[PDB]
Design a protein around this ligand. Structure first.
Ligand SMILES: OC[C@H]1O[C@@H](O)[C@H](O)[C@@H](O)[C@@H]1O
Lengths: 31, 126
């Protein structure tokens, strides 16, 4: 079973990025 | 030949605040079914430089990965693997390699009996 649809990306500010990443720690990308 | 930038990925435990902020829109929630795989197409913004994404689930893990579609030519950005995004919020980023379409794969093909509720946001930076 499969599905697909499109979603427009919203603009993210610098302070938005900082707000998120200030709480976050690195995670594995490629395992 | 065009080189692809490595992506970055993070995790944060503030998962309740995330969902609660997401649920305030319907177009930000997905219900991946049993054995189903949902692909979210995210076109590169004409005035953008990076992709940024967030996602999380309820109660169960899910397969996540990212591909880049050229414009059917594909580049593997984030290999598909199961993430414990029911315990934490997974965020990530990737520099636009060009004009095209990112393919965010929410893979629940391995689950026989459990549907996965998916909260997510996709962005771009100027
Ligand atoms: O219940 C344990 C496992 O069952 C599977 O169906 C779920 O998709 C997994 O997220 C879970 O780790």
């Amino acid at each position: 079973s499969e599905r697909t649809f499109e979603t427009a990306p919203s603009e993210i500010d610098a302070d938005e990025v900082l707000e998120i990443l200030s709480k976050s720690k690195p995670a594995p990308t490629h395992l | 030949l065009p080189v692809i930038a490595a992506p970055s990925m993070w995790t944060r435990p503030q998962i309740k605040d995330f969902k609660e902020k997401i649920q305030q829109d319907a177009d930000s929630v997905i219900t991946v079914g049993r054995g189903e795989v949902v692909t979210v197409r995210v076109p590169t913004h004409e005035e953008g430089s990076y992709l940024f994404w967030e996602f999380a689930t309820d109660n169960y893990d899910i397969g996540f990965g990212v591909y880049f579609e050229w414009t059917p030519l594909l580049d593997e950005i984030v290999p598909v693997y199961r993430r414990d995004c029911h315990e934490e919020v997974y965020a990530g980023s990737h520099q636009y390699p060009g004009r095209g379409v990112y393919l965010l794969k929410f893979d629940n093909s391995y689950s026989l009996w459990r549907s996965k509720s998916v909260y997510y946001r996709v962005y771009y930076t100027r």
